[PDB]
Amino acid sequence: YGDSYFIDTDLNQLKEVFSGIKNSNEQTPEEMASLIADLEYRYSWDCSPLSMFRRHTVYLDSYAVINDLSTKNEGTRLAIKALELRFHGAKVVSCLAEGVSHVIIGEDHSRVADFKAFRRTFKRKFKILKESWVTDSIDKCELQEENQYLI
Amino acid sequence: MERKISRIHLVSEPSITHFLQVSWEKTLESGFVITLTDGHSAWTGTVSESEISQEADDMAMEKGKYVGELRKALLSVYTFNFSKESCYFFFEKNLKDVSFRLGSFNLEKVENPAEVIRELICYCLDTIAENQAKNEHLQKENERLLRDWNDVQGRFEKCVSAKEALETDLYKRFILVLNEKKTKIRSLHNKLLNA
Amino acid sequence: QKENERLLRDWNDVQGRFEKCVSAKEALETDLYKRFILVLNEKKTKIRSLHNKLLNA
Amino acid sequence: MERKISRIHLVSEPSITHFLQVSWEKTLESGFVITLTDGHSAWTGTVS
Structure with a gap:
């Protein structure tokens, strides 16, 4: 690829190389x-900071029915919190399977009995x-301690 | 000077609406002017600090619960009774199978059924209109705030998407360059342990 | 009134967060390459060495 | 249906505020009911 094994190299040099690699998303x-x-x-x-939630899989409770992708509560401040979680490395997911470490609750607790x-x-x-x-x-x-933020 | 107006009945006339109007200086607690009407006739009273405070002294009801119960009763179970001649008005707190006295006014009526009804209507029509003006202003103001909020949403979504793509793209390219180095290091490390 | 209060707070909120995020995004690409340069040059040092030794034997 | 209360002065009566109430089905043009009152008396009629 034209980064020289026999020479140790700079920002501009690996930038060039990276722009010459093809575009793909198979992973x-x-x-x-x-x-x-x-x-x-x-x-x-x-x-x-921009990776702090990398090890968090997160479900976002804006769905009026847990796991039904039809029931989106758009225009709520939970939408900003999914931009935020994505911006800082969280695996934000639209369905709550076994793979989830965290559920995030806004103002509307009408779902918490059913999460629990x-x-x-x-x-x-x-x-x-x-x-x-x-x-x-x-x-x-920095990741703040979760226990003060429970339910 | 402050004021409230409210629709009532009397058990003395069960079939028909009346209007109480309650007007006071600073607080309901300094004392006040009260006015009853059917729609036809002018009843009035003035009942002031020295004796409104005497109510919660003649009665077993303490000041907070009584003035609170009165603003529930008066300023919208309670039950209201008046007679036009005697000008005695009274009301009482009805409970489940017990019942006890709340208040009464020996009112004294006035001469101007019309002037009374005019001020009541003018108060409503003004107070209506000022609120529709405020409702327009806050509506405009907070359209601006939502309009803006929705745009920063949009831009933030662009920035979040650009940040995700920046990571996965850079790491995929790093992974390719890095892994080829690691594979060659492995191959050579093994090839060198052997030769 | 309630909707005005909420949106005045919430507007200040996403305004600040967004501008913090824009600045952090604009640093991120320098950051990653600084980290990669070093790792990748150390790997090249290991490849130079092992391939030189393999050539001599 | 719509109604609309409006407060007026008759030329006859400088110091009495009167109330004009109009009531109709969105086009005023279809005809309306109209009330006047002064807080003591009331009058009505209709237009088509």
Whole structure:
């Protein structure tokens, strides 16, 4: 590819090389997230702010019916919190399967009894957190302790 | 000077609406002017600090619960009774199978059924109109705030998408360059342990 | 009144967060390449060495 | 249906505020009912 094994190289040199590599997306988003999560673990980039939620899979409770993709509550401040979670490395997901570590709750608690009930099913059990956990962690550039943000 | 107006009945005339009107200086607690009408006739009273505070002294009801119960009762179970001659008005807090006295006014009526009804209508029509003006202003103002909020939403979505694509794109290219180096290091490391 | 208060807060909110995000995005590409340069030059050092030794044997 | 209360002064009666009430089905043009009152008396009629 034209980065020289026999010479150690600069920003402009790897930029050129990167712009010459083709465009592709065969890696699954899930494969890719773990490649990134592993590289940031090896080289200690994992506390970097824009990756702080990398190890969080997150469901966002704007659906009036849990897991029904038809029931979106658009124009709520939860939409800004999904921009925020995505911007800082979270795997935001539109369906709550076994793979979820966190559920995020806004103003409308009309769903919390059913999250808590559905969570009785699970082998590894998600947390249910207030919106303010995402906010406070981004503002402090660092994962804030989840226990004060529970339910 | 402040004021409220409200529709009532009397058990003395069960079939028909009346209007109480309650007007006070600063608070309901300084004392006040009260006015009853059917739609035809002018009843009035003035009942002031020295004796409104005497109500919650003659009665077992304490000041907070009584003035609170009165603003529930008066300023919209309660039950209202008046007689036009005696000008006695009274009302009482009806409970489930017990019932106890709340208040009464020996009112004294006035001469101007019309002037009374005019001020009541003019108050409503003014208070209506000022609120529709405010409702336009806040509506405009907070269209601007939503209009703006929705645009920053849009731009933030563009920035979030550009940031995700920037990561996965850069890491995919890094992974390709890095992995080829790692594979060659492995191949050579093994090839060198062997030769 | 309620909707005005909410949106005045919420507008200040996403205005600040967005501009913080724009600045952070604009640093991100320098950051990643600085990290990659070093890792990739250290790997090249290991390849130079092992291939030189393999050539001599 | 629409109605609309409006407060007026008759030329006859400088100091009495009167109330004109109009009531109709969106086009005033279809005809309307009209009331006047002064807080003591009331009058009505209709236009087609």
